[PDB]
Ligand SMILES: CC(=O)N[C@H]1[C@H]([C@H](O)[C@H](O)CO)OC(C(=O)O)=C[C@@H]1O
């Protein structure tokens with residue numbers, strides 16, 4: 001019953017359908033794949049620094065576009081010729097829809113409502129893709145002309161260094177301009193402020209004043225949508241993406257409990273940025289923080305599943321790793337599972353044959369029950385400036401030393417098999433090199449496990465877990481090694 | 497004013513006054529030093545595994561003691577000879593007081609009230625000092641005879657491995673027996689359950705079950721004190737010492753939010769274990785979690801101030817650094833500063849001449865205002881089993897890299913001098929080796945700072961901070977180095 005909130009990004013549909021002359025009929029068909037599933041809400045993202053629709057207050061993606069011209073035109077000049085082709089696909093497809101008198105977002109919305117989906121607009125508040133290229137096609141002229149409006153003038157070590165500083169009146173006005181336009185143009189059920197594109201909105205050190213500013217911003221947005229409620233004659237929701245732990249959220253100027261208690265938002269999505277889905281997020285704590293506010297708390301997944309920040313693997317979640325994260329977060333009280341980067345092609349799970357199943361299963365413990373699942377140890381990609389970072393992997397165990405890993409496996413397993421699986425880096429073990437316990441109980445050595453992808457490029461050793469040992473929620477792997485070892489991977493595989 | 501809560505431990509008074517034949521008058525005079533200070537409660541601890549008073553349900557510290565005998569006697573046999581002298585100091589003074597018809601806790605409670613100090617009893621729930629010595633004097637016979645009731649059978653790498661398992665009925669009953677006697681024998685204004693001696697109460701992996709069990713335990717205790725309120729004809733307060741972060745507290749089976757909401761407790765002490773004071777604890781989050789409960793949230797300080805876990809430095813807080821931590825924790829909403837291990841001797845601040853000063857200043861922003869303070873970067877010593885650990889120091893910065901450190905410095909500085917001071921390990925810089933910024937602002941190179949204790953044993957470099965840079969709450973040091981450098985210390989010195 002909690003269900004699925006699914007984010008469709010600003011660029012995907014225009015990139016993947018480039019070169020077909022899209023009919024209103026085909027545009028509508030995109031909403032159909034999500035109909036009759038556990039999907040309750042599609043969050044349709046129309047923007048980055050530029051809009052994918054023909055905006056009158058902001059730059060459409062095709063501003064500067066010579067549609068008859070060659071790939072090497074001023075708008076695309078700054079990309080390598082190969083990347084001009086990909087980018088021109090997004091730009092041209094978007095442009096050609098506007099010329100055909102097709103407003104893709106008014107169409108998708110209309111169609112969502114026939115097919116029993118609540119349609120949302122999700123706004124990227126501070127996208128900074130490719131800001132290392134000040135000539136890039138997808139930056140706004142406002143950004144290009146106002147370097148003084150950026151977060152970090154003294155260094156460029158990351159893209160967020162060039163993000164807009166919302167400590168500026170001109171920056172808030174610039175994004176309130178697009179919100180004012182989206183509310184007037186589209187009759188949506190809700191607006192999602194996606195603060196997590198890219199998460200960083202203030203001068204380093206100013207995040208306190210930042211919190212006050214983003215609360216006063218959200219209140220002004222709530223007060224705008226209250227006027228549209230009258231003009232439309234139905235409730236319009238306001239929701240927000242925010243980081244996965246409450247110290248990080250407030251430390252990045254997002255005091256969400258305040259937003260919540262002031263009825264400024266009615267939905268919050270705790271999520272990582274990108275680098276990996278978090279399989280472990282403190283939902284129980286967020287629920288206590290939000291008690292009596294009537295906000296719906298959603299646990300946000302990302303498509304990547306990676307063991308540690310410096311890992312060279314860039315594989316995505318599978319149906320089994322997503323039922324793993326789903327089971328867990330629902331168990332911990334998630335009122336929605338929110339999918340970001342799980343689209344129908346290109347940016348998507350690699351086991352794309354399983355997408356129809358996924359959208360029919362991960363929105364409920366009922367439909368996850370008695371299905372194979374994988375609970376993988378990952379990491380939080382996002383931390384406030386100077387905030388101590390808690391990263392479990394990789395983990396070194398010296399001879400005679402103990403290391404514990406807690407993994408959230410949500411509902412107590414059904415009758416069947418449980419494996420605790422540990423990958424070892426550095427090119428090794430025998431059956432006794434590791435002593436492994438789960439919740440104190442000795443686990444049998446199984447041998448080398450042949451994982452399905454997502455999997456590491458190093459040996460994964462399996463240990464059979466007494467079923468009785470496994471608990472609701474966190475389950476604790478403890479290991480000791482008789483040889484020095486580095487762990488780069490840890491998961492529970494549960495096979496009812 | 498928020499004021500001070502000060503904890504007197506189970507052993508200190510008996511160790512330090514050993515060899516004096518204490519009269520009722522001297523016993524009473526121990527309270528008087530705290531009279532006229534900002535101390536609002538004394539938290540009088542009467543126990544480790546054994547009581548320091550003449551208990552009839554538990555072992556007094558002197559069970560098995562031969563008062564006339566040599567140091568080389570069974571109860572003391574297992575210690576080195578010179579350590580027998582210290583232990584017999586505690587055993588004999590405790591014993592000799594009982595023999596003189598002096599109940600030290602009854603005398604302190606009554607003397608507390610005469611001096612306008614609210615007397616509390618603080619019980620150590622699971623003290624495990626010297627559990628490596630199975631024959632040690634201060635273990636209860638009940639512990640020695642029941643190894644099956646300990647937390648971890650399958651290894652012995654830390655003292656907490658031999659702590660009692662509160663998952664067992666027998667363990668709970670053992671601890672409820674002492675609580676029932678404490679409530680009958682002493683007329684205290686409140687009891688504190690000190691979970692944080694030593695914080696580890698459950699088999700590894702059983703902390704969820706644990707949380708239900710400690711809530712019910714707390715509930716019986718509240719119901720017990722409800723009866724004694726009628727018999728005493730006043731309110732009896734119930735409180736607890738819990739870890740510094742909600743996720744660590746709940747992962748060690750302490751759901752203080754549930755305790756607070758159900759009116760089981762009215763005070764919560766968020767505290768480190770021992771290895772260092774935390775100068776940074778998320779007070780603001782705890783206040784939001786506890787909103788509408790009426791629970792007085794106390795920020796716990798410890799006496800040691802150490803930059804990281806593996807540091808060989810074991811220096812205590814000074815007046816300046818307790819001013820710093822106090823100013824920070826009150827600014828963020830601490831409704832009391834709670835001092836553990838800040839006694840009148842032996843276990844005490846190294847600058848003990850400043851102890852009278854400390855007791856009259858650290859319980860109010862007003863009395864701290866315009867006085868020199870030191871805000872030192874430390875760490876959280878306590879993490880739930882397999883909980884990823886966030887530890888800021890030490891921190892390596894490679895040539896051209898940026899490292900950030902957030903230090904909580906509470907109220908905006910008054911006119912004067914603000915130094916960001918950074919210690920560098922490994923044996924050596926020039927004035928242009930570090931570019932140092934606070935909230936973006938270039939800090940002038942000051943040179944070597946001669947820190948008073950507590951201080952690192954490696955060079956400390958000062959950086960003059962433009963006054964107007966400094967914000968209320970966190971202030972961000974950002975540093976980049978022209979050469980690879982390890983940071984072992986960071987603080988803000990504020991010198992109005
Ligand atoms: C085809 C492609 O790369 N799509 C990427 C998309 C795109 O870069 C953006 O829409 C530009 O605005 O961004 C994101 C993102 O996590 O935000 C993920 C997608 O993989």
Ligand SMILES: CC(=O)N[C@H]1[C@H]([C@H](O)[C@H](O)CO)OC(C(=O)O)=C[C@@H]1O
Pocket residue numbers: 505506507508511543544623625634770837842843
């Ligand atoms: C003299 C001495 O060492 N006292 C130590 C004391 C003692 O061990 C305990 O009271 C015995 O039960 O314990 C603590 C403590 O932080 O727990 C700190 C004291 O410095």
